[PDB]
Structures are given as C-alpha cells and as structure tokens.
A paper describes a structure:
S-layer proteins (SLPs) are self-assembling, crystalline proteins coating the cell surfaces of many prokaryotes. We determined the atomic resolution structures of all functional domains (I-III from N- to C-termini) present in the three S-layer proteins SlpA_ac, SlpX_ac, and SlpA_amy. The Lactobacillus S-layers are anchored to the cell wall through interaction with teichoic acids (TA), either lipoteichoic acid (LTA) or wall teichoic acid (WTA).
The full-length SlpX_ac shows differences in structure and domain arrangement compared to the SlpA architecture. SlpX_ac_III is structurally highly conserved compared to SlpA_ac_III and SlpA_amy_III, whereas the sequence is less conserved (37 to 41% identity, 52 to 56% similarity). The crystal structures of the TAB domains (SlpA_ac_III, SlpA_amy_III, and SlpX_ac_III) reveal high structural similarities. Mapping of the surface charges indicates a large, highly positively charged region within the interface of the two motifs that extends to the C-terminal part of the protein. The TAB domain (SlpX_ac_III) would still face inward and anchor the S-layer to the cell wall analogously to the SlpA-only layer.
Author numbering: 370 to 505
Amino acid sequence: DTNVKTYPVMVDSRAYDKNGNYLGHMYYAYDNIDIVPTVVTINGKTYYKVANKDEYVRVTNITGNQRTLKHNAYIYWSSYRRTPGTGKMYRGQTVTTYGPQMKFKNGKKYYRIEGCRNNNKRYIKAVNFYHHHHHH
Ligand SMILES: [Ca+2]
Ligand SMILES: [Zn+2]
Ligand SMILES: [Zn+2]
Ligand SMILES: [Zn+2]
C-alpha cells in the first residue's frame, strides 16, 4: 500500500472485514494508525482500510466529523467539570468531533472533540449541535 496517512485514533475503533463483520480486535485511542486515506462505504457507513491489512475502521473515529455549533458551549472534562483553563465556543463556530455520542454519568450525551487526550479531556454536550432546546 503506497498511499498512507498517519492519524491518532481518537475513539477505540472496532476492526471490520470488507463486509462489515467485526474481526474481534480493536485499534485504541490515542495510538497512531496508518490508513489508506480513501473513503470506503460498507452497509451505509464510511471506513478507511488499515495500511497492509484487509481491515476497516470507521472514519468518524479517525478524521471525525465537521459540526457547527447552534449554541454557546463550554468544554467539559466530565459531567460536572469544565476542561481546566478552557473558555467557550460560540454559536456558528465549527468543531471537529470524533465518534458517536457518548453518554456520561449525568445521563447526557457528549461528542469528543479535537485535542481530547487522557490528561486533556475535551467534550462538548451533543445538544449544542441541535436547534431545538425544549429542555431549559
Ligand atoms: Ca450553552
Ligand atoms: Zn441556545
Ligand atoms: Zn438559550
Ligand atoms: Zn439552549
């Protein structure tokens, strides 16, 4: 494989055959992974092929998703704690999120965002990417 990019795994990625069957192992955040940077669709979902393996990992977990804030957002380490020293992001700013929504112990859903590491945890509440806040 001659076309290869390196990216941190931002979310523990299940490894899948070309048919979208789980192979029983994972790639782990925040290790680097080598991928062929060509999007591959399998049963409606996007993957990258791991370099020199007939293995596929979800794009969302690697290069993630461009999302636009619909509301001012604080950056959270956990349910009740802001990432230390962080400010806010504003309605209209663009954020890279990785992976599906994650349910914290408060019961609310979060997106892991660019820069999140074990010593620098960075999440935004999912609702801040939706128009309707009928919950305030
Ligand atoms: Ca807010
Ligand atoms: Zn609002
Ligand atoms: Zn409001
Ligand atoms: Zn609101």
